[PDB]
């Protein structure tokens, strides 16, 4: 009930942040792009799989900066 609403709000934010971030990376804004991806990672309960996926899809120096941000 409220549990569904809680989960809905997180799932919307998660996908919206990843999609905003992806678009900023396409636009060559890595700075703001990574900031949004770190918002998606923040709401991720168990992020290790997500981080391994990001590591496959990002240049390593960018993955590395992302880690330094969390």
């Amino acid at each position: 009930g409220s549990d569904l609403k809680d989960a809905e709000a997180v799932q919307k934010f998660f996908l919206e942040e990843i999609q905003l971030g992806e678009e900023l990376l396409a636009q060559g804004d890595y700075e703001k792009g990574v900031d949004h991806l770190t918002n998606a990672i923040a709401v991720c309960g168990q992020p290790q799989q997500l981080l391994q996926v990001l590591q496959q899809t990002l240049p390593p120096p960018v993955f590395q900066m992302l880690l330094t941000k969390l």
Binding site: L4, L15, C44, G45, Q46, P47, Q49
Partner: peptide, 15 residues
């Protein structure tokens, strides 16, 4: 909400 694309992406993330 719920939307399939949010459900799928979240399931795909393993989060």
């Amino acid at each position: 909400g719920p939307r399939l694309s949010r459900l799928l992406s979240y399931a795909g993330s393993g989060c």
